[PDB]
Amino acid sequence: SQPSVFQCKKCFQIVGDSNAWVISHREYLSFTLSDAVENSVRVEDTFKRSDDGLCVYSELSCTRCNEVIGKVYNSTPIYLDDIRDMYTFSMDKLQAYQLG
Amino acid sequence: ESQPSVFQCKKCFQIVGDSNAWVISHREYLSFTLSDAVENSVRVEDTFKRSDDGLCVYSELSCTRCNEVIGKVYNSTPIYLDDIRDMYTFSMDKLQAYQLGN
Ligand SMILES: [Zn+2]
Ligand SMILES: [Zn+2]
């Protein structure tokens, strides 16, 4: 119906919204946007590996509370290309507000 | 560009409402006014006070999280300000806007 905005559950800093949505994965309790507020988010230095060894990602932090709230996938197999270099956030670390 | 904004208390970032409940706003008071806000986002203080020009009566609005005074509810007005009355009138100096992307 009506779009949503998304915030860190700790400090409430808005990290982006529905209109940059790409896909979600209830499997991993994640969701993925194509865009996000530059200043409210930080991609960390270290490349790290999915639990199944197959992907590489950098952690995402909220620039206000420094919680790790997501990941940016840098290396993927074919089938996870839609995620790659997108902002992939953890549902448990975020809150949605819908506009009504 | 036809895209909504969302509003938050500058201090804690609690969202208090959005553009879709918009009503009117006033450049000379650096304020804006909404017909709705998030249910538990906001507290009306029980003191009743007067505009600088003696004319209206408002109670202060506080952010239930950060206790900051962020606005007011005009309880009593003349005819012309009947738009404002019993509506959430926010202080632009104390709020923040986030306009969504496309
Ligand atoms: Zn945060
Ligand atoms: Zn606040």
Q: Are strands B49-50 and B22-26 parallel, antiparallel or unpaired?
A: unpaired
Amino acid at A75: S
Q: Which residues surround ligand 1, an ion (CB under 5 A)?
A: A 8, 10-11, 62, 64-65
Structure-determination technique: X-ray
Q: How open is the CA angle A93-A40-A100, to the nearest 5 degrees?
A: 65
Q: Which two tokens stand for residue A18?
A: 């529905």
DSSP run (H or E) holding B43: strand B42-44
Specified resolution (Å):
2.6
Amino acid at A100: G
What burial letters (b/e) apply to A66-85, b meaning 16+ CB within 10 Å? Answer: ebebbbbbeebeeebeebbe
Q: Considering only CB atoms, which chain A residues are within 8 Å of B20?
A: 2, 99-100
Ligand number nearest CA of A64 is 1
Residue A47 CB contacts under 8 Å (≥ 6 apart), including other chains: A56, A57, A58, A74
Distance CA B24, CA B83 (A): 8
Distance CA A90, CA A92 (A): 6
Alpha carbon A92 to its chain's center: 11
Terminal CA-to-CA distance of chain A, rounded, Å?
A: 8
